[PDB]
Chains A and B, each alone.
Chain A
Amino acid sequence: VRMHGNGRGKASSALPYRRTPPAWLKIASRNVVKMVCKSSRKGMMPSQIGMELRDSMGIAQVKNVTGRKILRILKHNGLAPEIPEDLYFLVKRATQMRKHLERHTTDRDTKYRLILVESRIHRLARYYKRVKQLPPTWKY
């Protein structure tokens, strides 16, 4: 969007004012918490867990049903990912780009885009170390 490039889009989601779960949801908060632990065991990431709960289960927002966020639940049960999810997906993209470039060496457009993702990694990794979500002396 705006960090790198000229994009100026505004697509997002708007949360409701009334944070009370609907009266037709009969599931107790114990079952919801038990159900995000099972999904996390399947190997799904926190973002994917919320979409599965919302799409086919009627739980629009976990925090409004159980009172705590998805990552908080996983951290309590010791199932959180080793490194933060957004940092994990950026490193995966940069690894595929470098694999592509080692064969197509004249692809000068992908070399410019590769420069931008590694600058994003360094800005992201600097923030996590400050709030101590990553070990000190962590390098990509």
Chain B
Amino acid sequence: MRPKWHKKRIKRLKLRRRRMRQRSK
């Protein structure tokens, strides 16, 4: 797909991972 859209997907996943790590810590 579009590399910009793929980068958006990566950013969303990283944000979700950061939130989950903060809540789980």
The answer to A–B direct touch (Cβ < 8 A) is no
**Chain B residues within 8 Å of A, Cβ to Cβ:** none
**Chain A residues within 8 Å of B, Cβ to Cβ:** none
